[PDB]
Amino acid sequence: SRLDKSKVINSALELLNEVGIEGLTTRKLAQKLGVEQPTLYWHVKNKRALLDALAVEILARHHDYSLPAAGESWQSFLRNNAMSFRRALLRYRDGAKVHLGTRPDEKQYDTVETQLRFMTENGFSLRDGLYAISAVSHFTLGAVLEQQEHLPPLLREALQIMDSDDGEQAFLHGLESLIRGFEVQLTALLQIV
Amino acid sequence: SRLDKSKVINSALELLNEVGIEGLTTRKLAQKLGVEQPTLYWHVKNKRALLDALAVEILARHHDYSLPAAGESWQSFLRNNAMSFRRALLRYRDGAKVHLGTRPDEKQYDTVETQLRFMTENGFSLRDGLYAISAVSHFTLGAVLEQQEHLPPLLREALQIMDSDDGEQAFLHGLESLIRGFEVQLTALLQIV
């Protein structure tokens, strides 16, 4: 079996879809690849190192709308961006947990740097622009984690709407509400709003 | 050592703070209590059963603002409620993960039922009221999980503001933005907003 960075990562992603993040160990990866554990150790030192590479790969392979298209509205950006982030996180089993547990690397920081410059350039104060980008992530993460991880009157009645969908509707609705609140805040400046 | 539902739960919460959710097993709970594993088994059948009780207890013991105080604004409710939920989730190590992994019980459903009746009574459509309550949870969960789980120019400059706080500011800012977006939606009805 071939032990190239690419092949290792892909086998790990395949294994991720089969056993999940808790059930993913270097032992099983070695057995999946059909190679002795010490052979694998030379390439991947531990589960932590494997996870970090997985998080990078998950995003790099599906989070395609990470940077604002030149001449686009900040609203449009935050919307498309959150949608990309969500789709990417849903592509793999426990994808959100893999992402949640890893710290960001150089690639993500330059991406974050761009978006911040983008926010400010559109009339956003550094902190408020930071808070905008953060709130979107937090809300997208919580929504995705709720999903991947999973009677009274009004609740029975309402429940049918939530259930007959993968949760996309509720998410998109909340996203809009979040984006609007920022508009109301952006265009308020020093006035009492 | 005493094996009363209360004593077991408290020991488990104490152990939770020491070893975390992954490091929490019935074996260690039995050793903490100073009793043979089969003695404990009679009381707690497995880790899943222990987790479910922990989630209920965490909330029941700290999520005090779960129901709207008679004669309060829906805005005030969602705000105080989200704050209570956050504080409660932060009280214990991996508190968000304990909550995330358990399915709701009768206690939570009646609480959810009340809040929905409360939302509708304030001019909210069942689905929109559901979406409002859900978006708040998702955002609070993602914010809390980000926290419990954890250089370019603009980012270095902004980073100092985020870091000199436990993340409460950013959270409260996003909460307000979320609540406003709902106002704009509630008071829009059948108009193009």
UniProtKB/Swiss-Prot annotation, chains A, B:
Alphabetical UniProt keywords? Antibiotic resistance, DNA-binding, Magnesium, Metal-binding, Plasmid, Repressor, Transcription, Transcription regulation
Residues that coordinate or bind tetracycline: 63, 81
Q: What induces it?
A: By the [Mg-tetracycline]+ complex.
Residues the UniProt record assigns to the DNA-binding region sit at 25-44
Biological process annotations from GO = negative regulation of DNA-templated transcription; response to antibiotic
- Annotated membrane-spanning segments are none
Q: Does the keyword Transcription regulation apply?
A: yes
Molecular function (GO) terms for this protein are:
DNA-binding transcription factor activity; metal ion binding; transcription cis-regulatory region binding
Span of domain HTH tetR-type: 2-62
Q: Name one Pfam family in it.
A: TetR_C_1
Query: Which InterPro entries does the entry link to?
Result: DNA-bd_HTH_TetR-type_CS (IPR023772), Homeodomain-like_sf (IPR009057), HTH-type_TetR-like_transc_reg (IPR050109), HTH_TetR (IPR001647), Repressor_TetR_C (IPR004111), Tet_transcr_reg_TetR (IPR003012), Tet_transcr_reg_TetR-rel_C_sf (IPR036271)
What highest taxon heads this organism's lineage?
Bacteria
**Keyword Secreted assigned:** no
Database matches in PANTHER family: HTH-TYPE TRANSCRIPTIONAL REGULATOR RUTR (PTHR30055), TRANSCRIPTIONAL REGULATORY PROTEIN (PTHR30055:SF151)
| Function per UniProt | TetR is the repressor of the tetracycline resistance element; its N-terminal region forms a helix-turn-helix structure and binds DNA. Binding of tetracycline to TetR reduces the repressor affinity for the tetracycline resistance gene (tetA) promoter operator sites.
* Subunit structure and binding partners: Homodimer.
Write down what this protein is called: Tetracycline repressor protein class D
Recorded source organism is: Escherichia coli
